[PDB]
Curated annotation (Swiss-Prot), chain A:
Full-protein interval shown: 600 to 1151 of 1447
Gene coding for it: gag-pol
Annotated site residues (Cleavage) in this chain: F427, Y428
Location of region: RT 'primer grip': 214-222
Effect of Y488F: Almost no effect on RNAase H activity and replication
Start and end residues of each RNase H type-1 domain: 421-539
Entry protein name: Reverse transcriptase/ribonuclease H
Length: 539, 401
């Protein structure tokens, strides 16, 4: 008998201030009992468990569904913390031959720490409880133990390292119970090396036996292409919250290869959630959204594998309403993968910022998947980005990129002047409101004598401070200077939004666009600054 | 050669921080470097029974193509026991010149406490999660950890004793993996003395604090003021009144009476000029009752002025600046804002280390995601300061310009 190579055990301790778990055993039918006895007998014969006695005051419950189901819940609550994302098909490199090997009895092939075996003790209840139950303890990694996956993974890695080092002409990916071996060698050489590998694993006592296409982790992996497993979108005349969560989940999962997937109109229904039972109707926007998603999921789309000798390209398109979509490819019309980005929750925003955020996301995802930053094709002029990042108060950066002309293009809708405008009218604006009656006034006075004060019901100080500016923008020429004492309004306008949730701000923006030159000045309030008439909006 | 027992703070477990994505080249560099370090007994591979992890990445120092390994020991440092205290050499900032040296190579001689090693655990990440990350833990003193210079203080004292008994006028400070050497010599004599000290360290950045001082609050000097000019002046003075007691603007605001065009020239009355003059005299004086509290945090705010110009203020209490400055330096960064910001944060942190002995907490004018995505690509320091993100445009931007 050839000695199977010794696998060094991993020292496991319980969390400090705790001892081995002690839970009683539940009553089982005689069928279950007999089944468990028959199982544990041959399990003992194979050396996976061992008989113990009353010297071990620790015990964990066990059921049967035959299949033995040991519950290590409390032991998991007592076991220490261990270390330890799935690989993405798009990042995988095209190989000529790929073998899938699933090791049988994965956990049962790895020895448990001998000083910890005493805590994995369980008891099979004898018939009618007229005898003390049969006592057992685990000598290997228990199914359902907290530390089993990490220890098995580390063991597998330690075993695989020399074969990998000795075989640089083949690539190995390790994932849980499975090893995946790819090579560009001839099929005979490949099969030979696979047999060599499983022999090398047999030396440590690991038994290995699927063919393409591989159904793995929601993916369909073909020899030359990859995709997702068919998405099942239920059609109900009565939707619930949980159904919307499932739907959005599946849409998200499908959106990694299917371009154009929108999920905003379905995600807006998930505010005021945590009630899993409800009936929420859909808007025409949401119905058309879901119908368009069915339109995209009508015909299957596939993605290709990664080739290191070619550039990595990511192209972005604006989808409207905070939605952005992107495609990552190397060759034209042949995507590695696709994706989407939704704007963050904010009161004010613009296109350039959202595009930037999107670029950041794609960069991080790319560095994760391929280990490099892709070149970007963005719907924004070089001069636009130039002006933006040069006149922006914040620091901002986008990696190597080029302008692609596929509308709608991201542009700057208005630019405030840096200095006061000569020959332009000067609107001293102001607004105020009563805190109690919600009655306010908003308006302006100019150097040419032009005045205006508008009375407003149901309003606040900030709303009037904005309203005055809006009034100044309405009744002024193509060029205009505006003076205000509102740090709030200036704070908003300096953030340069092209879209807002407040209609007033949106209208101010729409007014700004129609202008040629706009200089916005600021002054301290109540400092007796003439022109800045606070007394005109206080009456 | 003898390990000193090191523990953690009461009621604090070791650091469990997520390792962030790394590019392929950095991963290669880390693999090579850590292989070499493994062969030298500096670090060792660990099993899955080590649940602790500290972020790690690769950089490239000034005037060097060789990749360097940098560890983000921030969480471990703040979880590491407070090592006890040598008073900060206040004569260091007063010296004519100060040179920074990297004595990190000396730490790899002293072995680390065996029980404490499991807290210095880190992981080299794999691309696309195709294989489990490589796990290491330090056997010797790890660079970046605050306990390393504290442990090596005695050794460093015994080493630098002859040089300090030789040149008592040369001030020596130590922060993390860096050694600061201040003198009043000449740049040539300075460089030769630095060669002398570095070979002195062998057998066992040129800063100029004299050129770095504190800047005041100035007001424009014109012959003809416009309405806009006077308005900006009034805003700046009103803002400055939070810092200085006697700033008044009523006589200047009196000039803005009526509704005039912003570009219209207004002549200054005598009272207005008097008031402006008095305000100048007030602004020329320093700030009243401004002290440094070692028990409080240092706050550093940075504002982007544009055209490569940045401004910064270090303080502890609002409107009580301990330091002010303006980083206009341009090297290779012309087209990149984030690089400029990174270099600025580095310099400010350096000066902060020189002056007070510790690093400040930054308030950066940048979106979290942008910074978090690109700051490591331009980082060259061995230490790492704390930071938060201000995403609301400050009005005071042009008041420091
Ligand atoms: N069931 C299953 C499963 C199967 C394979 C997985 C996987 O293949 C590889 C493993 C080792 C080296 C190269 C590999 O492939 C790269 C791309 N690639 C994929 C399939 C194919 O048929 N051809 C081809 O070129 C990598 C992986 F990360 C997970 C895998 C999972």
């Amino acid at each position: 008998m050839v000695p199977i190579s010794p696998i060094e055990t991993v020292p496991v301790k319980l969390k400090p201030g705790m001892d081995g778990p002690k839970v009683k055993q539940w009553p089982l039918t005689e069928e279950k009992i007999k089944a468990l006895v028959e199982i544990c007998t041959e399990m003992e014969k194979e050396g996976k468990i061992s008989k113990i006695g009353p010297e071990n005051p620790y015990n964990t419950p066990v059921f049967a569904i035959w299949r033995k189901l040991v519950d290590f819940r409390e032991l998991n609550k007592r076991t220490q913390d261990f270390w330890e994302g799935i690989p993405h098909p798009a990042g995988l490199k095209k190989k000529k031959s790929v073998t899938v090997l699933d090791v049988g009895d994965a956990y049962f092939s790895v020895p448990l720490d001998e000083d910890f075996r005493k805590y994995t003790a369980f008891t099979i209840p004898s018939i009618n409880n007229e005898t003390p139950g049969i006592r057992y303890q685990y000598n290997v990694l228990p199914q359902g133990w907290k530390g089993s996956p990490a220890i098995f993974q580390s063991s597998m890695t330690k075993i695989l390292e020399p074969f990998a080092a000795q075989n640089p002409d083949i690539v190995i990916c390790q994932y849980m119970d499975d090893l995946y071996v790819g090579s560009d060698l001839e099929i005979g050489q490949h099969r030979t090396k696979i047999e060599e590998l499983r022999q090398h694993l047999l030396r440590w006592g690991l038994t290995t036996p699927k063919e393409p296409p591989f159904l793995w982790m929601g993916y369909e992996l073909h020899p030359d292409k990859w995709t997702v497993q068919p998405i099942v979108l239920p059609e109900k005349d009565s939707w619930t919250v949980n159904d919307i969560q499932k739907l959005v989940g599946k849409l998200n999962w499908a959106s990694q290869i299917y371009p154009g997937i929108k999920v905003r109109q379905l995600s807006k229904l998930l505010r005021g959630t945590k009630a899993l039972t409800e009936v929420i109707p859909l808007t025409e926007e949401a119905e058309l959204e879901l119908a368009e998603n069915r339109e995209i999921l009508k015909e299957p789309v596939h993605g290709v594998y990664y080739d290191p000798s070619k550039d990595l390209i990511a192209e972005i398109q604006k989808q409207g309403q905070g939605q952005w979509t992107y495609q990552i490819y190397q060759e034209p019309f042949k995507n590695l993968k696709t994706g989407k980005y939704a704007r963050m929750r904010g009161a004010h925003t613009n296109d350039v910022k959202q595009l930037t955020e999107a670029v950041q996301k794609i960069t991080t995802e790319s560095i994760v998947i391929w280990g490099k930053t892709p070149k970007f094709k963005l719907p924004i002029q070089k001069e636009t980005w130039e002006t933006w990042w040069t006149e922006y108060w914040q620091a901002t950066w986008i990696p190597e990129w080029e302008f692609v002309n596929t509308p709608p293009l991201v542009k700057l809708w208005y630019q405030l002047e840096k200095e006061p405008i000569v020959g332009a009218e000067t609107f001293y604006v102001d607004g105020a409101a009563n805190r109690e009656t919600k009655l306010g006034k908003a308006g302006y006075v100019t150097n040419k004598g032009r005045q205006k004060v508008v009375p407003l019901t149901n309003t606040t100080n900030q709303k009037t401070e904005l309203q005055a500016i809006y009034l100044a923008l309405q009744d002024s020429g193509l060029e205009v200077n505006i003076v205000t004492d509102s740090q709030y309004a200036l704070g908003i306008i300096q953030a340069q939004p092209d879209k807002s949730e407040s209609e007033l701000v949106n209208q101010i923006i729409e007014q700004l666009i129609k202008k040629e030159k706009v200089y916005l000045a600021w002054v301290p309030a109540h400092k007796g600054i003439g022109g800045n008439e606070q007394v005109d909006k206080l009456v | 050669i003898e390990t000193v027992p090191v523990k953690l703070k009461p009621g604090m477990d070791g650091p469990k921080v997520k390792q962030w994505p790394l590019t392929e080249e950095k991963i290669k560099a880390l693999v090579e470097i850590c292989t070499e370090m493994e062969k030298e007994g500096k670090i060792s591979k660990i099993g899955p029974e080590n649940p602790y992890n500290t972020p790690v990445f690769a950089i490239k120092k000034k005037d060097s193509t060789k990749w360097r390994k940098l560890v983000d020991f921030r969480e471990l440092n703040k979880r590491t026991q407070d090592f006890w205290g040598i008073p900060h050499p206040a004569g260091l900032k007063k010296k004519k010149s100060v040179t920074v040296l990297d004595v990190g190579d000396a730490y790899f001689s002293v072995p680390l406490d065996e029980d404490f090693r499991k807290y210095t655990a880190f992981t080299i990440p794999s691309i696309n999660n195709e294989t489990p990350g490589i796990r290491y833990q330090y056997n010797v003193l790890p660079q970046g950890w605050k306990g390393s210079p504290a442990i090596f203080q005695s050794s460093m004292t015994k080493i630098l004793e002859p040089f300090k008994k030789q040149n008592p006028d040369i001030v020596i400070y130590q922060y993390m993996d860096d050694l600061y050497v201040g003198s009043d010599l000449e740049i040539g004599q300075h460089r030769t003395k630095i060669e002398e000290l570095r070979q002195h360290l062998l057998r066992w950045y040129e800063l100029h604090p004299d050129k770095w001082t504190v800047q005041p609050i100035v007001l424009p000097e014109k012959d003809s003021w416009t309405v806009n000019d006077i308005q900006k002046l009034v805003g700046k003075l009103n803002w400055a009144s939070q810092i200085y007691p006697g700033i008044k603007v009523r006589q200047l605001s009196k000039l803005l009476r009526g509704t005039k065009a912003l570009t219209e020239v207004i002549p200054l009355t005598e009272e207005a000029e008097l008031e402006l003059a008095e305000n100048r005299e007030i602004l020329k004086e320093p700030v009243h009752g401004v002290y440094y509290d070692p028990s409080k945090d240092l706050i550093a705010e940075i504002q982007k002025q544009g055209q490569g110009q940045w401004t910064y203020q270090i303080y502890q209490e609002p409107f009580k600046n301990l330091k002010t400055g303006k980083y206009a330096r341009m090297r290779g960064a012309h087209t990149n804002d984030v690089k400029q910001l990174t270099e600025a944060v580095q310099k400010i942190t350096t000066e902060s280390i020189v002056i007070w002995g510790k690093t400040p907490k930054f308030k950066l004018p940048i979106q979290k995601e942008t910074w978090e995505t690109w700051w490591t690509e331009y980082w060259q320091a061995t230490w790492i300061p704390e930071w938060e993100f201000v995403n609301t445009p400050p009005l005071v931007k042009l008041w420091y310009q």
